[PDB]
Scaffold this active site. Structure first.
Site, PDB file in Angstrom:
ATOM      1  N   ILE A   1       0.869  -1.179   0.000  1.00 24.88           N
ATOM      2  CA  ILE A   1       0.000   0.000   0.000  1.00 24.88           C
ATOM      3  C   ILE A   1       0.904   1.227   0.000  1.00 24.88           C
ATOM      4  O   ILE A   1       1.783   1.355   0.867  1.00 24.88           O
ATOM      5  CB  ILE A   1      -0.963   0.066   1.220  1.00 24.88           C
ATOM      6  CG1 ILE A   1      -1.613  -1.302   1.510  1.00 24.88           C
ATOM      7  CG2 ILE A   1      -2.027   1.126   0.975  1.00 24.88           C
ATOM      8  CD1 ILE A   1      -2.385  -1.428   2.815  1.00 24.88           C
ATOM      9  N   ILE A   2       0.710   2.110  -0.966  1.00 24.88           N
ATOM     10  CA  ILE A   2       1.396   3.398  -0.970  1.00 24.88           C
ATOM     11  C   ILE A   2       0.379   4.442  -0.546  1.00 24.88           C
ATOM     12  O   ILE A   2      -0.736   4.443  -1.058  1.00 24.88           O
ATOM     13  CB  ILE A   2       1.990   3.683  -2.363  1.00 24.88           C
ATOM     14  CG1 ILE A   2       3.035   2.612  -2.702  1.00 24.88           C
ATOM     15  CG2 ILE A   2       2.602   5.096  -2.439  1.00 24.88           C
ATOM     16  CD1 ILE A   2       3.317   2.520  -4.176  1.00 24.88           C
TER      17      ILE A   2
ATOM     18  N   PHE B   1       7.370   5.080  -6.981  1.00 24.12           N
ATOM     19  CA  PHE B   1       7.885   4.277  -5.841  1.00 24.12           C
ATOM     20  C   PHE B   1       7.522   2.779  -5.910  1.00 24.12           C
ATOM     21  O   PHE B   1       8.211   1.947  -5.311  1.00 24.12           O
ATOM     22  CB  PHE B   1       7.420   4.860  -4.488  1.00 24.12           C
ATOM     23  CG  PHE B   1       7.951   6.248  -4.184  1.00 24.12           C
ATOM     24  CD1 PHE B   1       9.192   6.692  -4.682  1.00 24.12           C
ATOM     25  CD2 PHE B   1       7.236   7.097  -3.344  1.00 24.12           C
ATOM     26  CE1 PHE B   1       9.681   7.968  -4.372  1.00 24.12           C
ATOM     27  CE2 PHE B   1       7.724   8.373  -3.020  1.00 24.12           C
ATOM     28  CZ  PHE B   1       8.944   8.812  -3.540  1.00 24.12           C
TER      29      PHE B   1
ATOM     30  N   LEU C   1       2.185  -3.530 -14.465  1.00 20.77           N
ATOM     31  CA  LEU C   1       3.320  -3.219 -13.593  1.00 20.77           C
ATOM     32  C   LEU C   1       3.930  -4.500 -12.935  1.00 20.77           C
ATOM     33  O   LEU C   1       5.161  -4.716 -12.959  1.00 20.77           O
ATOM     34  CB  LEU C   1       2.926  -2.193 -12.539  1.00 20.77           C
ATOM     35  CG  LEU C   1       3.957  -1.948 -11.403  1.00 20.77           C
ATOM     36  CD1 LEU C   1       5.280  -1.281 -11.820  1.00 20.77           C
ATOM     37  CD2 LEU C   1       3.357  -1.109 -10.294  1.00 20.77           C
ATOM     38  N   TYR C   2       3.076  -5.351 -12.373  1.00 24.38           N
ATOM     39  CA  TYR C   2       3.574  -6.587 -11.762  1.00 24.38           C
ATOM     40  C   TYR C   2       4.238  -7.484 -12.816  1.00 24.38           C
ATOM     41  O   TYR C   2       5.280  -8.092 -12.526  1.00 24.38           O
ATOM     42  CB  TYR C   2       2.494  -7.334 -10.988  1.00 24.38           C
ATOM     43  CG  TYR C   2       2.005  -6.616  -9.745  1.00 24.38           C
ATOM     44  CD1 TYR C   2       2.886  -6.246  -8.703  1.00 24.38           C
ATOM     45  CD2 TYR C   2       0.652  -6.329  -9.588  1.00 24.38           C
ATOM     46  CE1 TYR C   2       2.426  -5.579  -7.572  1.00 24.38           C
ATOM     47  CE2 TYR C   2       0.177  -5.652  -8.449  1.00 24.38           C
ATOM     48  CZ  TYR C   2       1.062  -5.289  -7.452  1.00 24.38           C
ATOM     49  OH  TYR C   2       0.581  -4.641  -6.339  1.00 24.38           O
ATOM     50  N   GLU C   3       3.649  -7.542 -14.015  1.00 28.72           N
ATOM     51  CA  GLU C   3       4.240  -8.283 -15.142  1.00 28.72           C
ATOM     52  C   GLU C   3       5.635  -7.805 -15.496  1.00 28.72           C
ATOM     53  O   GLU C   3       6.522  -8.630 -15.704  1.00 28.72           O
ATOM     54  CB  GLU C   3       3.336  -8.275 -16.385  1.00 28.72           C
ATOM     55  CG  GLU C   3       2.271  -9.359 -16.284  1.00 28.72           C
ATOM     56  CD  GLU C   3       1.142  -9.265 -17.289  1.00 28.72           C
ATOM     57  OE1 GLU C   3       1.135  -8.370 -18.180  1.00 28.72           O
ATOM     58  OE2 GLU C   3       0.222 -10.117 -17.150  1.00 28.72           O
TER      59      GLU C   3
END
Lengths: 166, 168, 170, 172, 172, 170, 168, 171, 171, 166, 167, 167
Positions: free
Chosen positions: D87-88, D97, D132-134
């Protein structure tokens, strides 16, 4: 301007200082820590009742104790201890009368008795003036100060105390 | 009147205890006798959620402690309770008793939904008797030598009022 | 109004909860346990802190004034139903906060808790409140006869409900 | 960014943890126990302080601003797997970030904890997060149908994983 | 029938209570606490043995056969109301016991407990039970929409009540 | 088969539960707590007896032979989902009990607990079990890569699900 | 073989205790020393859910108590453990050791998913050394005066095997 | 250097202990219990305060700068052995303090605790540390294969020991 | 009748106590705690075994048939008063036992417990019982209006008392 | 065929009977109830170690006690009590040697010492034959039986005991 | 002008500092400690325990001079072990003799003990002779009693009775 | 041929039956009881308490004859209160005199007490005279001490020392 109030946990230090064998509800103790545990255990136990005596400034004057309270026979043993610094001030008479007043007008007891050293004839005479009468001369009852000593047992009855002026 | 009732709290125990120090008789908390503040405090902790008694401290606008309204022996089948009121010595004679009696009845009959409130009052206190009579209480008993008070057995009146009578 | 927030009840909010009842002349319950004193409430709060059968949200404005309370009680996770109550503090009544808070409660119930049915009770002698709940989409499903002893007599209450599917398709 | 640090969660960080959920419109858990209030969270923190099944790291910058949270939950030490979440804080989103913190979490998981598999769940309706996770090397292993009730309806989530070997080669 | 008795529930009756639910395909509660197992029930019985919010009576015949259960729950002593339920064991249904037991429950509620209102819930899809309660003097005060999930769907229930005054006149 | 019954797990059934694992060469959990010994299991049973996050049913035949176990774990009452597992005792495998018990579990999950989704894991190396669950209406939603260390290597599992609406409209 | 391993239970403590009464050294339970059965029992209750050690009692077909397989110092980051085996005096010389070592390795490497198992063996016991070598253990240390055993400090071999080696 | 002191660890030193592990990239233990947070460490410190299985000494200079930590763990009072570790704070490395502190630790172990054997583990990939311990009189007794997972791979460590009789001389 | 005895209640008598309330159609209390079941009664008996606020005596005949119960409740040892109740089992009513048992209860109250006042409550709608208590020397001191909800309506009760001095005579 | 085994809760009766001031981990007791509480409190405490001696039939023969165990100095005080009915059977020698064996081969202690009444020269000589040597003659150390009495302090070292036959 | 007074909580710092010189292991009521925190817990636990008694020695200006310790006080046998520690800075002022006599005085005239004994390193024959001049006599030569400073050392046990001190 | 033996659990029934005659309130270690169940709990609670000591009296055939009770035993003042109860069936056999002497013997030769006292109803001058012949002397006439049988009654307190009994 002397008052009686029910003994509180905060008064235990005073109780302990008033002593040096001591008992709390028939249980022996020597240390403050022992006394404190005994106080917690017996807080609601009715067999004994204690009242600390205070003056107007809340100085601790002494202790009124009823022990061996029996609610069938309606009798109890009374003891009074005045702190050394407050002896000789004539407080004893007043406190005896307060104790009797509580015993006879609030607790509805029938008989209050006490023990007093035969070697303390001054105390004997004081209790006699408060209306106590000798009912026994107990022979070598207590080992006190290196020898067996005699004590007077003295009593007063409810009906006698409450009608004294009638 | 600017008098309020609120439910008794732990912080009020000192006041409860001081209210008895004046009094004649022996005090009880949920039918358990007590003499000292320490005893009272243990009894308060033990019975905090017990419904058989309910207590309300009376305060004025300035939060002066005026007195105590007590319902004891509350029975939820027969819907009855015994009522007592104690006004602190400094606040007696100010006519607070009438108002507080009515507040107690109001709470008993409009909120608790009780059917009957009764009380005991010393036969030797005919002033209090007459006051309760004006609040609508009626004598239902003259209890002979019921209580040992002040060195002798004394008679008390038992006086009651019913929900239906109060709510009309 | 847009600026009203709900947050989960905390220990520090118990005073406010307690003061909210002191107006009301009904008997208060905490997880089905009755209380009158703050001390009683505090013990009940400690005992039930992780119990999920009830959920409470204190309503605040932008300045952190305490506006009122949203309560879900009798939450059943098989039937997926709960009873809703709202208490607005006396000083904040009449300001139109009720409608907003009702909608927030429904939103939380139906979009987050995934409940199926919310119901409430409202005094038959308060037809204004009845009509307000009706405008929020509640419908009468019961007229409960002499359900509660309130203020010296037995009173009737409406039971009113709304379903998740109805609220989400508005 | 290079200047972001992870440190083990402390009692004083609970306020921040609690504030991080107040945005989110999802139900929070602490060691699988649900909570909504700070008081509930605090009791749960005291109860589980030495429990190893979850591990949490608060992210700070050089000035000790609270940036976000890295969470490993469901850590199983036989299968050597864990679920990861990040969590940002709203004010620190969009600063790039996320990438750095994902890599820090993986680094700790794979070089220090010696886990074998890290997985996560991501809303199918959030294809930006998926991508992004990829790019961080996660691959889809499931498309979970109506897994979670979120925001008034049942929603699908991707389950995405990455293995220790693969993360420890990507840098070689 | 005249020979049916009610007696206060005892620890030894828990087996019977538990067996009475095993037929029913609904979730059971003991003082608002859910249970499925006998062991759970037994712990709940020990915990609530002196609690007044519920009262239970097992119904026996002259030979001490276990006939069924009369339950008062949600007893509130301010509003003087309670919810009533009756379960008759499968082998004893159709013998006309229901009417007698309903009347016994009301008798105890209104002449001994001094309650003001007894209510119950009955499936709208069970119009026979509705009509039986109506003959005992209960009146519909609600038609609760999709109140309970029973047997694969949400179902409506009637809420039916009877007041103390009315039950204590019906016999005059 | 029609004559198989499910009943709620009791303390006396722990021996059977424990014996069911002694075959299996995997690590067992009770409410997410690992155990190997009967003594460990017993303490865990006492601790979690009223906890609703898991539900267990022992399967018996007409003669009260212990047939197997139906387990729902990870029950979440917001998302309304649970993980299902079935263990049939070695002596009762191959008798066609699996299909019946799967259907009983689904029945209880969907008609009584009112859950929305049931899922399970099945070894990719067990395509027979996969196909059986498919015939019971489960669909693959995941192929979890090296999810579990089983029998000396990391193995893939299928995650398979069925929804309440699909089961109830069959 | 017809030998089985099962997880240690409270009822097995007597056997555990009797297994040491023969032995030279001082016994430990989760790194806590003990001499009496009463001490052992308290330590068993305290550590029942603790994962740092795992014990298996070995039985034959008739449920005779054959011996004990112990994994201690289990670390779940480094994935290593120390292994010990004790065979009851009456069952030594029957060739059980080989089978039990392999069972322990099997459990360690196929179920616990550990990476490394090590053990200590007295340098003065070259027979045991050679047996462990045949099971695939290799010496990685010769620990000088590591343990006080039987009136003097003695050297022990530390011997290990890795998961990858055992599973091939 | 002559001016370095050891003193028994106190509650107030926990912050320093905690700070010491932060750069180290390994998992820390307190009496065999793992911790990552200061709060965890503090609870572990309270629980084990009188437990003798481990002993810790913080190293200070003349100005009371916090130099590092001397740790004895796994102290066994039957076998009379212990595992020794030393951590020097990053800013104080390279000043030649290690040699002195090793000798202080040995002194305390062998002249006050009356232990028989002190051993330690050192990364095979740190041959500089190996050689330093060798100069202090430690000898290799094992080369532990893939003992620890450190920094993304299994690594070998030397186990090195010294005996009381060897450390103590003679006249 | 002369052959009736009182003895202090024991655990084994609880069944009889419980059976006695079953026909009575009222709510039972044990030391002010309500109960309906035997299991509740048994727990209450264990809790209050040494509590002196109530005293119970089971009445037996020569053959040890269970005749009934004498109960003193609300015993207050400051005011020296108690409430008395008697229950005679249905099969033993009408045999003239009540008079004897009332006198036994008074005897114990006034010659052994040393109480000052015994009172009781009796339904106004039971004038036969009223007159019986009057013959035993009890006098009405109150007519309590709608005191109890009994059998579907609020009912009045007489409160009747006798004093120790009146019961005890003289020579 | 005499065995030593670690003291168990079931042996407390025997311990108590072996006595009549007694101490358990330096805490005084007179009653069995006191002893039992002290046993529960100190069960894992290492400062003292006790072994009951049994024969083949599990008759309770006596007690071997190590107290004041210090793990820095590696020393302990040894005491042995043989039950009255088993004295004079030559058991003492065997049990002394068993205690020394445990102390020196398993506990790895350096020094065992004991106290023995100067007025008991038979016991002195027996310990001397077991290899103990006098290191002190403690003057009026103990008040025993109405007077102050002297005791010998006698010791043996690990290296001496373990090499005796070498 | 030296005074003895009973040890108080505030004196623990001084007690702890007195050991920091001395290369032995410290004990409080037979419990070992190294840190101040350990000492403080031990002080709280044993505050009313009579088996040990401590007196801090002060001069006229309230400088902390040292410590007189009676340990292993047994009230049946009426014996105690005595130790004295003088702070490094006050050594060489001949305070040892005075403090020994104060300790004996308290032991024999107030506590009514029968025997005081002490241990002294055989390797410290100067201290032996000092105690001999104070009236102590050797009653034991304890062989390898203590591990001190890297080796086992012998100690003399020395006593005086108390009848001898009072006459 | 009468023997005294220490009270055991199995004797409680007899103790309880001994009170069922006697129209007084019974006490066990100063705690009141009426039922056997109460007595049994009190017995378990006070089993090791020395403040009271009881001896059941048996004949040659093990008939239960009665009870010798010492209560309020104080070990500082060395005094106790004595009571004796003979079962109704064994009264009139002159066992009282023998049992009084046995009790005194045990009190003075084994317990080493200094004083034994008892209470006896003033309305029972026969019992007074019997105790006088056993060597007891009146030391008090306690006014309205006990409520017994519907009125307050006086009791004599009578004592013998221990020296008088042993000489």
């Amino acid at each position: 301007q002397l008052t009686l109030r029910a003994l509180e946990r905060g008064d235990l230090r005073f109780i302990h200082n008033l002593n040096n064998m001591s008992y709390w509800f028939q249980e022996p103790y020597e240390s403050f820590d022992q006394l404190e545990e005994l106080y917690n255990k017996h807080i609601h136990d009715n067999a004994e009742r204690r009242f600390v005596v205070e003056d107007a400034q809340k100085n601790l004057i002494g202790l009124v104790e009823l022990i061996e309270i029996n609610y069938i026979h309606r009798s109890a043993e009374f003891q009074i201890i005045i702190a050394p610094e407050h002896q000789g001030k004539g407080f004893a008479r007043t406190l005896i009368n307060r104790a009797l007043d509580y015993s006879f007008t609030i607790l509805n007891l029938h008989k209050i008795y006490l023990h007093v050293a035969v070697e303390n004839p001054k105390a004997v005479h004081l209790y006699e003036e408060c209306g106590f009468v000798e009912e026994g001369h107990l022979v070598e009852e207590f080992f006190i100060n290196g020898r067996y000593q005699d004590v007077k047992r003295m009593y007063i009855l409810q009906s006698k105390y409450l009608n004294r002026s009638e």
